[PDB]
From Swiss-Prot, chain B:
The gene is PSMA5. One of its GO terms (cellular component) is proteasome complex. It comes from Homo sapiens (Human). This is Proteasome subunit alpha type-5. One of its GO terms (biological process) is proteasome-mediated ubiquitin-dependent protein catabolic process. Belongs to the peptidase T1A family.
UniProtKB/Swiss-Prot annotation, chain D:
It is found in: Cytoplasm; Nucleus. The gene is PSMA1. Induction: Induced in breast cancer tissue (at protein level). Up-regulated in liver tumor tissues. This is Proteasome subunit alpha type-1. The 26S proteasome consists of a 20S proteasome core and two 19S regulatory subunits. The 20S proteasome core is a barrel-shaped complex made of 28 subunits that are arranged in four stacked rings. The two outer rings are each formed by seven alpha subunits, and the two inner rings are formed by seven beta subunits. The proteolytic activity is exerted by three beta-subunits PSMB5, PSMB6 and PSMB7. Interacts with NOTCH3. Interacts with ZFAND1. The modification Phosphoserine is found at residues 107, 174. InterPro entries: Ntn_hydrolases_N, Proteasome_alpha, Proteasome_alpha-type, Proteasome_alpha1, Proteasome_asu_N, Proteasome_sua/b.
Curated annotation (Swiss-Prot), chain F:
One of its GO terms (biological process) is proteasome-mediated ubiquitin-dependent protein catabolic process. CDD domains: proteasome_alpha_type_3. Component of the 20S core proteasome complex involved in the proteolytic degradation of most intracellular proteins. This complex plays numerous essential roles within the cell by associating with different regulatory particles. Associated with two 19S regulatory particles, forms the 26S proteasome and thus participates in the ATP-dependent degradation of ubiquitinated proteins. Keywords: Acetylation, Cytoplasm, Host-virus interaction, Nucleus, Phosphoprotein, Proteasome. The gene is PSMA3. Induction: Down-regulated by antioxidants BO-653 and probucol. Up-regulated by bacterial lipopolysaccharides (LPS) and TNF. The 26S proteasome consists of a 20S proteasome core and two 19S regulatory subunits. The 20S proteasome core is a barrel-shaped complex made of 28 subunits that are arranged in four stacked rings. The two outer rings are each formed by seven alpha subunits, and the two inner rings are formed by seven beta subunits. The proteolytic activity is exerted by three beta-subunits PSMB5, PSMB6 and PSMB7. Interacts with AURKB. Interacts with CDKN1A. Interacts with MDM2 and RB1. Interacts with the C-terminus of TBXA2R isoform 2. Interacts with DNAJB2. This is Proteasome subunit alpha type-3.
Curated annotation (Swiss-Prot), chain H:
GO terms for cellular component: cilium; cytoplasm; cytosol; extracellular exosome; mitochondrion; myofibril; nuclear matrix; nucleoplasm. This is Proteasome subunit alpha type-6. The 26S proteasome consists of a 20S proteasome core and two 19S regulatory subunits. The 20S proteasome core is a barrel-shaped complex made of 28 subunits that are arranged in four stacked rings. The two outer rings are each formed by seven alpha subunits, and the two inner rings are formed by seven beta subunits. The proteolytic activity is exerted by three beta-subunits PSMB5, PSMB6 and PSMB7. Interacts with ALKBH4. Keywords: Acetylation, Cytoplasm, Glycoprotein, Nucleus, Phosphoprotein, Proteasome. PANTHER family: PROTEASOME SUBUNIT ALPHA/BETA. The modification Phosphoserine is found at residues 16, 62-63. It holds the Pfam family Proteasome_A_N.
Length: 204, 233, 237, 234, 230, 239, 248, 244
């Protein structure tokens, strides 16, 4: 399967007045790890991030083409993009390739630039959007991730509890997937600060 | 103000008649056809001692059996020459034989009226070529010289001059030319005539001469070989 | 798209647009070239000075490739287009041939570009002349000139732009085996040629050199005024 | 004036000055004659030489085994039109394995040369043709014009001083249908000779002959090959 | 095949006369008025209603672009219809990508850019109209003008077409920042009365309003009610 | 100057290039068409510009379909091009819809093509007027005339060219509704001989064609012997 | 059609491009616009023409445009033409960033746009764009920079410069007061107000009537700001206080 | 200003210094070159078009001389102006209506068809290379909600709906006649719609028609198909007018 060629996993999670987004760090080609610090989460805003799992080349191309489109939007418009509006922009970019798609399935996590209301979504590879109030997952260990998130996630979590939850969901999920892991990165996004951590994690 | 393909009341295309007037601004060139080969000779028209005379090329090789002398707006000649070269190689590619001088001249002359400004491609010619050409070579019909002008009219000539002093030079050619004449006589004759008509004193750097012969490929004369012929003249 | 013939023949066989492009060239800053023995030099006028100008941004000498550069006189916007097309072509050549361009190859390319824009619908001619210099792979030094018509020639030395006629007359009398025996004198020959037309000497001669293999040196105004005073005190004697 | 530069501008008299001007190109070419009998069609042309040392311009061109042409006007237009004709003849033999009938080829010319007379920035063809051919309907002489109009002829002359030829051809045309080939070419040459200044004669250097008919594919006679035809204008 | 050359060029003095001359068409157009209230916007225009034979309701000058944006003009009506159509199409193109109604300022920019094209592109003349564009987004009202050159401007209030100079000074001496919508409708109609001639009916003026609820035209019976005080 | 382009109205709302093209038709020799009980007959005054031309040459009567004739006046190359358009239109109709194109529809289509050349600086108006004639049991006899503006109307009788008016007045004397094609040929020939100016332009050929019950709805040249008798009738009626 | 074609991209007999020259006249009448380079930054200062009492004040400036994170520009001439060009600038800058994943160097952005302008003078028979632009920016190759381009597609880099109304006069004043290698943003601001004070001779200078934007570096990041009116008034006052000291 | 002109503003559709389009103004004069007038009136129950039918030549097939055209089964039209231009505009209208039906699955409204034709005409007022059509189109049909409709569009690309209108040589005079007749009528509507239309035309020309000198086209709420009256049907209205 094309989506498993590089492996990898991203998820996002909602809390009270905050969101988290997390990703594995492996860049591999089938069985072979090539690197352990590959970037899969990209800022699209001060309080707005997009994580992409899938074919590594397309992760990079989508992030770059999206940033092009976003930078033009912000110059032309007043303003910083709203989370919901970035989702639609991504949907549109992915569906343009309906018949020869990018092999990536994004998650978006952020806070509204004026209201600071938490937002998360994911999209399939042709741009079908999906908003939730709890969590989203994408990657080669989606089943593992769903099991962790459905069992651990609770409503209205403060930034500390959200960090522990998303971290445990990622770690324990990727430890059941051969082609995901070699490290985890977690961003916690609040009104006044971004907190970025790498986790202690298995490297097999 | 009018279009480039407008006829005059006399039935000529204005742009073609005007292009022919530009030939009269060019340097004089002369061609003579003999049974032993053809020669081509051209006034360089050096405008400064700082100019390198060998960087004025007004006789060019088309193929091993065909040379071309030009007069008028020399920059316009480049597409025409390249077309003659490509066409002789195409013919060699396809038929494994040398193209006749007449055929080469024809192919080039079919470009002459291919200009206009609403029929054609996003970039076709907007005006005729301000250039006349003498094609001199040897094929199975023997030695041969043809003249072409911007109208696309071409014709075989036993001897011809083109450019500024062509009336003049053409009269002198009618006086000296005969069908039994040798190539060496025709080379002297054309150096004599360029000498009369040139505004500068003739020497071995401000003219070019080339030949093509039955036995022998296109040959541009060296400074040294020019000096040899210049002695008697 | 615009299919109008812009350059057309007039009665008498003139191409007026081309002649008018040449008038553009004659109002351009003076530019000079000399072909030395083992060096080639280019220099060009002021133009108007201006203390507040960033000098770097308005140079009129330009590398095309490692072994070929040029100067121009005329419309500077037109020049920039011609320059980048020649730069593209040098790399195109190197691609399909793995030798650098000869100086004549790229000169011939530039000139045929310029000729095309005198014979294509919807375009005016380029309002520039260029002096193109460099060395071939066999070490022979080269100076060529092109003008708006697409005509080109090789020169021992030459000027273009305003007051080219008197600078060429100066070079005709002053270019000899003695004036090009060394590099220093070759460089000086270019500066005496400019200082003749250059209104407040000097100051406002940009200058540049190319030695066999060594690639393009431009000179700073500390390295220029050395040569200036080194010639000015000589013409007193 | 404001009406004479564009083929798309009708004058207030219902004329198109550009087309009339293109016709002048053919009036100034050297004369050529076309005539036919029951069995053959013949073309005869005067060739002009720019000087004593130039060849003498070609005036007669092969189109197909059964069709040839004589030209007057801009030679470059003559060649372009000739190449179109040749192509239509090849196409018809490729498709049908039989010669293109001459009247159909002429129609194709009419349709093709009319097109630029009605489009801005285009120009008429500056050439007139005499077309000799032979098909199932026998010999033909057609004439084509810069107007794109064409004519089916018992005989014809075009070019400079061609009125004299036309007058000769009218005088003798009732004899043509029953002539043998030798007689018919002689008639063609006498018509052409009427176009000449009294000083000048027909020679092997200035006469070109084209012949096609029942027994014979289109054949061009130049230089020494015209001598048999010139001997016995007595 | 098309004329590929520009029909608007620079004169010796640096003027683009075809644009000025477009402006002169706009100056001879029927009066139009735009007022930005605190809680909304009003557009109003005169219907040059010759003959009682016209069916007044059959065509409109005040037009919806989206649920939240509306338009009026002064100048040549058929040129206006082109721009109404393009504006609508631009609004939808934006909505398909962003799934959000186009902000008024973004719509105006895109429409003004189209107007600029017709001052430079081959074989065409500029539009002989100025648009007034009203809208509501970010909980706040907007009023814009866009002229034949493609230049646009944001206004608190303005007037265009016949007698606009006077209309503008009338509004200067009458608009304030804290003005309500219902009062703004009144003063908009008064500005039109200042250059009317003929007695106003609900059938020969057209009024559009814009607020939080959206953009709509006023109905004849609503306009009648505002005219009962005038 | 307001008369240089078909894309320019004059200040009185005329399109002078179309009027100038009409003038080319009005300089041409005369063609007529007559509809009768059982078909349509065409005649043309064919001026003889040289005795060197073949008797037949420069036809001004064409078959545009098997059931449709075309008669032209004006600039002949324009007319011939229009006959090819008409042919293509009839051919395409048969391919797409499966039956012989109705005369009225063919006229309307070709007329709209003619009309398209009256709007633009890029092209000029055609310099020709033409008539189209046909007959079938279902549609009866039909005769249409199209001018350089692209206006098309149906006729009982019609004339185009320089003796247009003189021809019309002679045509008005016939009760053509009640007559047959075999009778009308003689009258067409007669009318051509009346309007011919034998002092100004000397010699002419008569060209005749017809389409009717007697040709089973096929457009055909009038046979030689019938033409010659119609000429003889016309000549002796002139007297 | 030949008759109607005004022939915008041909030479005149003296080797001139009339439409280019005429566009330059249009610019000379437009709102004055200056740029000034200092050791710690760059500024644009522009006259506002959108000054009627009833205008609504909706954007953060009138004639100052952000091009990317490290660059901004101002314009003088036909506003609608300037909107086309500034839009295109933004596009070019994003294309370069896409391809190389670093910001476009300032000079390369200017050159790219200038080649578009040049093309309009040589082919296509369209009118040129009636715009001159001042570009300010920072890049890692040459640091703080100021460029000027005009309708010919010609440009140059400047330590200080002016376009629009009373240009010649403003460049005279800059030639005299500008200290090559010794300006600060604080001194260049005072000079800008000094020059705008001279060149708006119709009539007495005000905050509502000018726009200033500064471009500085802070914490490895480029900062671009449009001065609020309070700062502009406070700067005007300091220039008026300084002219009181002008004699004794 | 006042009739001023610069450059080519009388030859192509560019603005004059007053902001006028002379070429459009001349297209309106071209409407009158045809010599005809047409009138159209709407009542609660029907809409009617009447125009002059001028057959000077005895040699015309008068069945083919008409300015009345079916656009769809339910939309009728009268053309005034240059004839071949008019035909072209009729074809385009038929094409637009058929197209509308194919894409949207219901008949084009009369107002929309008129608008579409007006939008097409507008293009010729803004692009230099072609002239406007020297003709005017009046359209009749029944609208499901609004009742009978009369619409007109012109060479400037203006269009409007009407209680009644006119086109051609006597347009202004017809406008005046129709105005004075509607002021009298309570709720500002006509009733005896065919008679009003013919009477308007008869007055402004001063003719008193034969049945073969006019054509009449109708659509009614009860019978919305466009119908052209026969000579006899027309005669009955002419006879009924005479007898009071
Ligand atoms: K137009
Ligand atoms: Mg794992
Ligand atoms: Mg492992």
């Amino acid at each position: 399967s094309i989506m498993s060629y590089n492996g990898g996993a991203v998820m996002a999670m909602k809390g009270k007045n905050c969101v988290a987004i997390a990703a594995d760090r492996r860049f591999g080609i089938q069985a072979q790890m090539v690197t352990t610090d590959f970037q899969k989460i990209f800022p699209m805003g001060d309080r707005l991030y997009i994580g992409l799992a899938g074919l590594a080349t397309d992760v990079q191309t989508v992030a770059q083409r999206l940033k092009f489109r976003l930078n033009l939007y912000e110059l032309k418009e007043g303003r910083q993009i709203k989370p919901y509006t970035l989702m639609s922009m991504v949907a549109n970019l992915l569906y343009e390739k309906r018949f020869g798609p990018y092999y990536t399935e994004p998650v978006i996590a952020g806070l509204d630039p004026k209201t600071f209301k938490p937002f998360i979504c994911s999209l399939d590879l042709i741009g079908c959007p999906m908003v939730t109030d709890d969590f989203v997952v994408s990657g080669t260990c989606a089943e593992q991730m769903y099991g962790m998130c459905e069992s651990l996630w609770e409503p209205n979590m403060d930034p500390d509890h959200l960090f522990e939850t998303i971290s445990q969901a990622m770690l324990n999920a990727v430890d059941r997937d051969a082609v995901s892991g070699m490290g985890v990165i977690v961003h916690i996004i609040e009104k006044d600060k971004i907190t970025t951590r790498t986790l202690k994690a298995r490297m097999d | 103000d009018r279009g480039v393909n407008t006829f005059s009341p006399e039935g000529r295309l204005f742009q073609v008649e005007y292009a022919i007037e530009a030939i009269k601004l060019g340097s004089t060139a002369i061609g003579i056809q003999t049974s032993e080969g053809v020669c081509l000779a051209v006034e360089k028209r050096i405008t400064s001692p700082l100019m390198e005379p060998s960087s004025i090329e007004k006789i060019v090789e088309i193929d091993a059996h065909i040379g071309c002398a030009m007069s008028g707006l020399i920059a316009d000649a480049k597409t025409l020459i390249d077309k003659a070269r490509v066409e002789t190689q195409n013919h060699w590619f396809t038929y494994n034989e040398t193209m006749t001088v007449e055929s080469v001249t024809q192919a080039v002359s079919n470009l002459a009226l291919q200009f206009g400004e609403e029929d054609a491609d996003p970039g076709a010619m907007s005006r005729p070529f301000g250039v006349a050409l003498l094609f001199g070579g040897v094929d199975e019909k023997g030695p041969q010289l043809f003249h072409m002008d911007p109208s696309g009219t071409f014709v075989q000539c036993d001897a011809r001059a083109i450019g500024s002093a062509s009336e003049g030079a053409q009269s002198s050619l009618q006086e000296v030319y005969h069908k039994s004449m040798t190539l060496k006589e025709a080379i002297k004759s054309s150096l004599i005539i360029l000498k009369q008509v040139m505004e500068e004193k003739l020497n071995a750097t401000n003219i070019e001469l080339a030949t093509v012969q039955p036995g022998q490929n296109f040959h541009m004369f060296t400074k040294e070989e020019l000096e040899e012929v210049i002695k008697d003249i | 798209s615009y299919d109008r013939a812009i350059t057309v023949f007039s009665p008498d066989g003139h191409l007026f647009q081309v002649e008018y492009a040449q008038e553009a060239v004659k109002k351009g800053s003076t530019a000079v070239g000399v072909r030395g023995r083992d060096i080639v030099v280019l220099g060009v006028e002021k133009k108007s000075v201006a203390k507040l100008q960033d000098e770097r941004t308005v140079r009129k000498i330009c590398a095309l490739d490692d072994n070929v550069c040029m100067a121009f006189a005329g419309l500077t916007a037109d020049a920039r287009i011609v320059i980048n097309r020649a730069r593209v072509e040098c790399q195109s050549h190197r691609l399909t041939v793995e030798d650098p361009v000869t100086v004549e190859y790229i000169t011939r390319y530039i000139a045929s570009l310029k000729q095309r824009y005198t014979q294509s619908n919807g375009r005016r001619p380029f309002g520039i002349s260029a002096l193109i210099v460099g060395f071939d792979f066999d070490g022979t030094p080269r100076l060529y000139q092109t003008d708006p018509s697409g005509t080109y020639h090789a020169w021992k030395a030459n000027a273009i732009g305003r007051g080219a006629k008197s600078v060429r007359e100066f070079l005709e009398k002053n270019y000899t085996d003695e004036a090009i025996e060394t590099d220093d004198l070759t460089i000086k020959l270019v500066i005496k040629a400019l200082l003749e037309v250059v209104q407040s000497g000097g100051k406002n001669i940009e200058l540049a050199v190319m030695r066999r293999d060594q690639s393009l040196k431009i000179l700073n105004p500390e390295e220029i005024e050395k040569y200036v005073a080194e010639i000015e005190k000589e013409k007193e004697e | 004036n404001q009406y004479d530069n564009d083929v798309t501008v009708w004058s207030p008299q219902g004329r198109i000055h550009q087309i009339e001007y293109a016709m002048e190109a053919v009036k100034q070419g050297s004369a050529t004659v076309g005539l036919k009998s029951k069995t053959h069609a013949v073309l005869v042309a005067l060739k002009r030489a720019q000087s004593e040392l130039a060849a003498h311009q070609k005036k007669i061109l092969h189109v197909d085994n059964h069709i040839g042409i004589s030209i007057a006007g801009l030679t470059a237009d003559a060649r372009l039109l000739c190449n179109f004709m040749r192509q239509e003849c090849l196409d018809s033999r490729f498709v049908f394995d039989r010669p293109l009938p001459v009247s159909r080829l002429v129609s194709l010319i009419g349709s093709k040369t009319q097109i630029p007379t009605q489009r801005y920035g285009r120009r008429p063809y500056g050439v007139g043709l005499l077309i000799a051919g032979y098909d199932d309907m026998g010999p033909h002489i057609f004439q084509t014009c810069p107007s794109a109009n064409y004519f089916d002829c018992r005989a014809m002359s075009i070019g400079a001083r061609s009125q004299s030829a036309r007058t000769y051809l009218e005088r003798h045309m009732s004899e043509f249908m029953e002539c043998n080939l030798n007689e018919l070419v002689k008639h063609g040459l006498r018509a052409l000779r009427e176009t000449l200044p009294a000083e000048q004669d027909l020679t092997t250097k200035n006469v070109s002959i084209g012949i096609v008919g029942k027994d014979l594919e289109f054949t061009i006679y130049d230089d020494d090959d015209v001598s048999p035809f010139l001997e016995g204008l007595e | 095949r098309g004329y590929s050359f520009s029909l608007t060029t620079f004169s010796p003095s640096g003027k683009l006369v075809q644009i000025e001359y477009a402006l002169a068409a706009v100056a001879g157009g029927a009066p139009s008025v735009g007022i930005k209230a605190a809680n909304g916007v009003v557009l109003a225009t005169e219907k040059k209603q010759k003959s009682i034979l016209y069916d007044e309701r059959s065509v409109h000058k005040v037009e919806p672009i989206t649920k939240h944006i509306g338009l009026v003009y002064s100048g040549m009506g058929p040129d206006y219809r082109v721009l109404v159509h393009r504006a609508r199409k631009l609004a939808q193109q934006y909505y398909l990508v962003y799934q959000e109604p186009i902000p008024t300022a973004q719509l105006v920019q895109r429409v003004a850019s189209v107007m600029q094209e017709y001052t430079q592109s081959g074989g065409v003349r500029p539009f002989g109209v100025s648009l007034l564009i009203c809208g509501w987004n970010e909980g706040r009202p907007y009023l814009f003008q866009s002229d034949p050159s493609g230049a646009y401007f944001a206004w608190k209030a303005t007037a265009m077409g016949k007698n606009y100079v006077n209309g503008k000074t009338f509004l200067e001496k009458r608009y304030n920042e804290d003005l309500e919508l219902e009062d703004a409708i009144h003063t908009a109609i008064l500005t039109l009365k200042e250059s009317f001639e003929g007695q106003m009916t609900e059938d020969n003026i057209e009024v559009g309003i814009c607020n939080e609820a959206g953009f709509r035209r006023l109905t004849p019976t609503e306009v009648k009610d505002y005219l009962a005080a005038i | 100057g307001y008369d240089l382009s078909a894309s320019t109205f004059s200040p009185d709302g005329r399109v002078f290039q179309v009027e100038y093209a009409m003038k080319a038709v009005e300089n041409s020799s005369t063609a007529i068409g007559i509809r009768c009980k059982d078909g349509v007959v065409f005649g043309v005054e064919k001026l003889v510009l040289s005795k060197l031309y073949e008797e037949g040459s420069n036809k001004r009567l064409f078959n545009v379909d098997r059931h449709v004739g075309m008669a032209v006046a004006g600039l002949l190359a324009d007319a011939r091009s229009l006959a090819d358009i008409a042919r293509e239109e009839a051919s395409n109709f048969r391919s797409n819809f499966g039956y012989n194109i109705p005369l009225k529809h063919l006229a309307d289509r070709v007329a709209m093509y003619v009309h398209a050349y009256t709007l633009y600086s890029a092209v000029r108006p055609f310099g020709c007027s033409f008539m189209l004639g046909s007959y079938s049991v279902n549609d009866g006899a039909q005769l249409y005339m199209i001018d350089p503006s692209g206006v098309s109307y149906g006729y009982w009788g019609c004339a185009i060219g320089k003796a247009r008016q003189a021809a019309k007045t002679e045509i008005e004397k016939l009760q053509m509704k009640e007559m047959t094609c075999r009778d009308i040929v003689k009258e067409v020939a007669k009318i051509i001989y009346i309007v011919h100016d034998e002092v100004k332009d000397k010699a002419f050929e008569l060209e005749l064609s017809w389409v009717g019950e007697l040709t089973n709805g096929r457009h055909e040249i009038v046979p030689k012997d019938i033409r010659e008798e119609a000429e003889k009738y016309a000549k002796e009626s002139l007297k | 059609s030949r008759r109607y074609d005004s022939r915008t991209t041909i030479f005149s007999p003296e080797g001139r491009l009339y439409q280019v020259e005429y566009a330059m006249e249009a610019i000379g009448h437009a709102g004055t616009c200056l740029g000034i380079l200092a050791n710690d930054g760059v500024l644009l200062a522009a006259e506002r023409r959108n000054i009627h009492k009833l205008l609504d004040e909706v954007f953060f400036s009138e004639k100052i445009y952000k091009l990317n994170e490290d660059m901004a520009c101002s314009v003088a001439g036909i506003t609608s033409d300037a909107n086309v060009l500034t839009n295109e600038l933004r596009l070019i800058a994003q294309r370069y960033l896409l391809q190389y994943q670093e910001p476009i160097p300032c000079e390369q952005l200017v050159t790219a746009l200038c080649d578009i302008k040049q093309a309009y003078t040589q082919f296509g028979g369209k009118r040129p764009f009636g715009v001159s632009l001042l570009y300010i920016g920072w890049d890692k190759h040459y640091g703080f920079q100021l460029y000027q381009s005009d309708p010919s597609g010609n440009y140059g880099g400047w330590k200080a410069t002016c376009i629009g109304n009373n240009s010649a006069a403003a460049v005279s004043m800059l030639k005299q007061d500008y200290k090559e290698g010794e300006m600060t943003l604080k001194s260049a601001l005072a000079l800008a107000i000094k020059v705008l004070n001279k060149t708006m001779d119709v009539s007495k200078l005000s905050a509502e009537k000018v726009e200033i934007a500064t471009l500085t570096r802070e914490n490895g990041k480029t900062v671009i700001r449009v001065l609020k009116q309070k700062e502009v008034e406070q700067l005007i006052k300091k220039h008026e206080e300084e002219e009181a000291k002008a004699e004794r | 200003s006042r009739g001023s002109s610069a450059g080519f503003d009388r030859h192509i559709t560019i603005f004059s210094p007053e902001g006028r389009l002379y070429q459009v103004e001349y297209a309106f004069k071209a409407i009158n070159q045809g010599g005809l007038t047409s009138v159209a009136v709407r009542g609660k129950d029907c809409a009617v078009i009447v125009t002059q039918k001028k057959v000077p030549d005895k040699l015309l097939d008068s069945s083919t001389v008409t300015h009345l055209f079916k656009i769809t089964e339910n939309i009728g039209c009268v053309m005034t102006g240059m004839t071949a231009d008019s035909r072209s505009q009729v074809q385009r209208a038929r094409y637009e209506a058929a197209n509308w039906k194919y894409k949207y699955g219901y008949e084009i409204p009369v107002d929309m068809l008129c608008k579409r034709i007006a939008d097409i005409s507008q293009v010729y007022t803004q692009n230099a290379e072609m002239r406007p059509l020297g003709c005017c189109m009046i359209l009749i049909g029944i609208d499901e909600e609004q009742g009978p409709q009369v619409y007109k569009c012109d060479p400037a690309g203006y269009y409007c709906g009407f209680k009644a209108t006119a086109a051609g040589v006597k347009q202004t005079e017809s406008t005046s006649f129709l105005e004075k007749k509607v002021k009298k009528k309570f709720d500002w509507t006509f009733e005896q719609t065919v008679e009003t239309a013919i009477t308007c035309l008869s007055t402004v020309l001063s003719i008193d028609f034969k049945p073969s000198e006019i054509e009449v086209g109708v659509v009614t709420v009860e019978n919305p198909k466009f119908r052209i009256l026969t000579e006899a049907e027309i005669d009955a209205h002419l006879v009924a007018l005479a007898e009071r």
